[PDB]
Symmetry: C3
Subunit: 131 residues, 3 copies
């Protein structure tokens, strides 16, 4: 079968938000899949996909680690402003769920950054079962 | 049909140029397609291609926006040293033409940077017509 | 035929190492292929692949240049902390070998960085012989 899925959201809101940031630029994103507000990504994709996150500079400090499914830790979108760090590929399980942790010190300053999350299907695995 | 096209030019000229910068490294680029001097890209590709631009840091200021076809604005190779910004995907029309605007303030300094422009065919769309 | 190869190693070693750095996170890498300790990449792949190296900032200086096969020089993983620089494509020969040169000054500082080396097979060439 061919699942033909792509997803890509962009953010360009005008000024100061009342809270957590949504997305208004559906650039291609037929099913929705990953809710980017809570970051709860259900991939049914089950092939090799091409992933690209946009990292906000924030030289002011604070450690950002996007938790990865099956192991915890495993910062794949890693920024230091059993466990491995990877950028290009994607050991993601079918139906499993990634979650962003943004809590690494409480003596911080208030700031709201802007984030772009693209992610397009490259290869859907075609059965690949032998006996 | 299979159009089997790739294009990728590179720049490694020795020193100070008399004007606008050409390309001597045809890395793979059978037809030529995009003239990178005037930046006039005719894509007959008409499927999904994988685009990667190389962004020169230039912290000194000046806003750089590569104009996109069909809408104007639409900075896809965006650097802030109807309208959306995208990096991974490519809504490009068949036969349409992209152009680089490099004019955002006239009280600037003279500098000549070096730029690498790759772009390879991933998927040619195979008819995809039903009735 | 279907060559079905992917390769990607990751590094998350705990602290201060006695020399050149190996890899403990085989994330997907069935044959192994490229030993990144000695940097001796044997591609039998013979196809167009998408390779991406992670560049350590190192603002302190020192010229980094990864030698490319068939020409010498030709820095493909280029960082300025007949010869061309390319990021996306790969004019690489079957069975030939790329090597990192890390020697551009002797009056420097001692440092150890951590490096992640991904590289995934996009297209295996399917004969493409006519007469």
């Amino acid at each position: 079968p061919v699942p033909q899925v792509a997803f890509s959201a962009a953010l360009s809101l005008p000024r100061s938000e009342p809270g957590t940031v949504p997305f208004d630029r559906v650039l291609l994103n037929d099913g929705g899949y990953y809710d980017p507000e809570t970051g709860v990504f259900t991939a049914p994709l089950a092939g090799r996909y091409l992933l690209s996150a946009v990292l906000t500079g924030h030289r002011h400090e604070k450690v950002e680690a996007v938790l990865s499914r099956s192991n915890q830790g495993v910062a794949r979108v890693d920024s230091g402003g059993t466990l491995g760090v990877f950028s290009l590929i994607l050991p993601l399980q079918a139906g499993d769920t990634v979650c962003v942790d943004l809590v690494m010190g409480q003596l911080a300053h208030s700031e709201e950054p802007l984030t772009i999350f693209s992610g397009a299907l490259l290869y859907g695995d075609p059965e690949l079962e032998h006996a």
